[PDB]
Amino acid sequence: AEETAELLKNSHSVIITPGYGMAVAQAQYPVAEITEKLRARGINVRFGIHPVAGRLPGHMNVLLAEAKVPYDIVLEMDEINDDFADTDTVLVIGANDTVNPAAQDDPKSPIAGMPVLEVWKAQNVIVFKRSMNTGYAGVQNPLFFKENTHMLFGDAKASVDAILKAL
Amino acid sequence: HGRIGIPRERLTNETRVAATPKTVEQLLKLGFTVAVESGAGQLASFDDKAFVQAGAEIVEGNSVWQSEIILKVNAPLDDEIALLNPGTTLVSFIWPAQNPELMQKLAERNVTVMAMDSVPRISRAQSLDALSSMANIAGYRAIVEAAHEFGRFFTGQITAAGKVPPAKVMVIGAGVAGLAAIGAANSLGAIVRAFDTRPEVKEQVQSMGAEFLELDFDGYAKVMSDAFIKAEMELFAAQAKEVDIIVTTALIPGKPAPKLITREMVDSMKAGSVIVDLAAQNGGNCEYTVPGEIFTTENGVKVIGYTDLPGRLPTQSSQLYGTNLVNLLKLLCKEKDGNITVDFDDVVIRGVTVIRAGEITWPAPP
Amino acid sequence: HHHGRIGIPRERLTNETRVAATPKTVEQLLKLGFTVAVESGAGQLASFDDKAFVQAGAEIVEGNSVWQSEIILKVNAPLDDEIALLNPGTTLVSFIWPAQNPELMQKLAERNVTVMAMDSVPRISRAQSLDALSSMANIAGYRAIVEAAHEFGRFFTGQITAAGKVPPAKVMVIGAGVAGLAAIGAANSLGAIVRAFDTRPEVKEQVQSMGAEFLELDMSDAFIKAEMELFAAQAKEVDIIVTTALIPGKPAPKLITREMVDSMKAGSVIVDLAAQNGGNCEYTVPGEIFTTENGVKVIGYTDLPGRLPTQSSQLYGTNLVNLLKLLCKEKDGNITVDFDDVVIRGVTVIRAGEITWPAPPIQV
Ligand SMILES: NC(=O)c1ccc[n+]([C@@H]2O[C@H](COP(=O)([O-])OP(=O)(O)OC[C@H]3O[C@@H](n4cnc5c(N)ncnc54)[C@H](OP(=O)(O)O)[C@@H]3O)[C@@H](O)[C@H]2O)c1
Ligand SMILES: NC(=O)c1ccc[n+]([C@@H]2O[C@H](COP(=O)([O-])OP(=O)(O)OC[C@H]3O[C@@H](n4cnc5c(N)ncnc54)[C@H](O)[C@@H]3O)[C@@H](O)[C@H]2O)c1
DSSP: OHHHHHHHHHOSEEEEEOSBHHHHTTTHHHHHHHHHHHHHHOOEEEEEEOSSSSSSSSTHHHHHHHHTOOTTTEEESOOOHHHHHHOSEEEEOBOGGGGOHHHHTSTTSSSTTOOOOOOTTSSEEEEEOSSSOOSSOOOSOTTTTSSSEEEEOSOHHHHHHHHHHHO | OOEEEEOBOOSTTOOOBSOOHHHHHHHHHTTSEEEEETTTBGGGTBOHHHHHHHTOEEEOGGGGSSSSEEEOSSOOOHHHHHHOOTTOEEEEOOOTTTOHHHHHHHHHTTOEEEESSOOOOSTGGGGTOHHHHHHHHHHHHHHHHHHHHOSSOSSOEEOSSOEEOOOEEEEESOOHHHHHHHHHHHHHTOEEEEEOSOGGGHHHHHHHTEEEOOOOOOHHHHHHOHHHHHHHHHHHHHHHTTOSEEEEOOOOSSSOOOOOBOHHHHHTSOSSEEEEEGGGGGTOSBSSOOTTSEEEETTTEEEEOOTTTTTSSHHHHHHHHHHHHHHHHHHHTSSSSOOOOOOSSSHHHHHHEEEETTEEOOSOOO | OOTTEEEEOBOOOSSOOOBSOOHHHHHHHHHTTOEEEEETTHHHHTTSOHHHHHHHTEEEEOSGGGGSSSEEEOSSOOOHHHHHHOOTEEEEEEOOOTTTOHHHHHHHHHTTEEEEESSOOOOSHHHHHHOHHHHHHHHHHHHHHHHHHHHOSSOSSOOBOSSOBOOOOEEEEESIIIIIHHHHHHHHHHTOEEEEEOSSTHHHHHHHHTTOEEOOOOOOTTHHHHHHHHHHHHHTTOSEEEEOOOBTTBOOOOOBOHHHHTTSOSSEEEEESGGGGTOSBSSOOTTSEEEOSSSEEEEOOTTTTTSSHHHHHHHHHHHHHHHHHHHSTTOOSSOOOOOSSHHHHHHOSBBTTBOOOSOSOOOO
């Protein structure tokens, strides 16, 4: 997370992606404080709430209201593709399969033809996954391996919780 | 014999019974014999053998009336007055300020008339306070029948295709019913809001999960003021642009509900929306409200004046009315024992005891 | 002519409150580079101000004019008169139920329209964004909770009320897919005691996440009867059975026996969401409620997906928006009828008269 801190302040645009990690780890409550802080810094934040991600439709949408995250920055399944390219630190809070190329580009993942958030080769895609483990697949997707698209080997809450005070 | 009689509600199109099986059990515990009419709860889905599950004597028709406690679910109609017996602890929704005629009539029947609506509205008494418990249930149920006719979800959610926005619910005239309506909408995941003159309710509104809309401006003097009714109508004009549910709540016992929202402004409200008028059982706080119906305002605000709302959630209203009645009979049968010790020094009981054994004892120490 | 213009009919189905797109959805369609036309009186169904369609950006046409467009985004089948209005070429996009509607198919093929079956979108993952049945089931999941609470005896929420403690609703969601998930969400939000069941292992994690008891699997034969035994022994304890269990293209199995219903607690509701495609409960009176002796409101509302006017119109409309996103990927404003992608290849049951049903076998 010590990286992700410096990375955040660099970003200008930040896509926060709520895919499962957010919810399970309660990372939505602390995210609300840090995003508010990023807002004060002047950072173009977009939450990309793709519904079909991990567990149940909506869910994390109202969980962000619980966290008291503004619905202005909550973009629910808005295909904010052009901002995706413009974004530097995409905080992929878990969410690997919801952004997984091998689900649509390759018809390969069990989630057959998943409309994944096309954020590969953005400016940075820090995928909060504590291991290269199978999500609903995550077969061979550059989001695991690459330099900008890379697995942050930390928990969803834990990583947010450090960057919350670090930044 | 000290037998509690649980009737069916024989008022036309009321949906309660006095007690559900679970609550009948609680009346057994009280040390009285408990008899329920032949399948009295079928309005609220519980038959004879369902009350045999609780362990209730199924009094076969009229023998229900021959009992020293009759937990009537609403007022006796003259039919039932004739059926009542003197000396009986007739514990019911009497509505004394709405029913001075009934007061004179039950005085002639010489009954101990305990008006369940007329409990002193204080902390300790809230468990006995049927007025507020049924209002509370009706508040929850107003939110229900609002989602029955609502265009949208309360529950904001991105679905596999599209965004559902969280609904904006404005409760207006926040009685206890309004507070529970906030709790209901909040459980469903709606942006809840509330307005009333009285600052006492705000604490609860904020807690159960809502924005208490300030009067963009004593409490009675304020409430009467012309600029105040302007200011209310400005809060209403403002919310009309955005809201999804309005719950019109300010029901007064006796007085018809103040017609707050002028018809014009309802037409101006955001369409695909509901105004559930709880206050519809006397007057109703919207001016559109024809009691009984869903009047769809031509924009698409269905002003649902369901007068029968406290009835409408049948087993709940029965369960909790039953629990208010058990609560009363707890302090009425403190020893157990099983004898109706009607208290006077306990001023809340002195409240509810609007008539005792003939002589009208209404009103009561405030 | 009216290429690049949409036509949205006022829907003429009985027990209907949907239009194909509400004002917000009309704006969506506008954003997609199209122009919209809607029939007059659509608002009345959708409980929305009809003038607000114009205010949003729709030509509120008087009626049949709607049919002369690029795409006719329409909710249910074209009735046979509407069929005779369908313009040769025009991309018609509706609930077709292809295999169930052989003759309707033929009539639309003669009318030479580009029929896309919004119900029969080949149900993989991006398909669900396009699939009208996803949103309709999701409508019905919430709507199971609502219509349940319309006839429910108790609260959902275990509110320790002033009067006394509430025994909560135990919401036994059978068939946790899509509508099941929405019912689980809604009931969990209320803090009703959710118990849910679905065949696929993935739902287990989800039910567990919502503080909700997952009913274990004890398949197909032999198991179908153990599902029955679970649902009976569970029906004793539960309140609201949200019976979603539907297998696409098959009638909903009669898992809720009348006997099972009459064994339950009173004051309770079994909502058949799968009512229209088979009836999962037996006691399901299609298009009505029926209260039993024991006191369970079996709500067999076939019309559940229609029952929530503005949002149903919104979400069906956004399924259409997602379809036009995959079709008109440039968002140029005319219907690029994509055949390269599997999903459009399957949903376009009839490309302009030529019956292009199905897609090559894309295993769901
Ligand atoms: N939401 C719905 O409506 C719904 C319904 C049904 C199915 N689904 C499906 O779920 C699919 C996958 O979505 P998804 O990628 O969001 O979820 P997922 O596949 O369940 O999770 C993906 C990854 O998130 C990581 N993660 C979880 N908790 C985290 C934490 N505490 N700390 C760090 N990393 C965390 C895990 O990696 P580590 O183990 O290494 O941490 C896991 O491999 C969707 O494409 C959709 O098909 C969604
Ligand atoms: N990738 C995603 O995030 C996503 C999300 C939702 C659905 N889907 C797709 O939807 C497709 C079809 O499923 P659906 O849910 O839309 O269908 P549906 O609405 O016709 O059926 C609803 C549910 O009923 C369940 N059911 C059937 N028989 C059952 C039984 N005997 N006991 C218990 N439950 C039973 C099914 O499992 C299904 O989930 C799936 O193959 C999947 O590809 C994908």
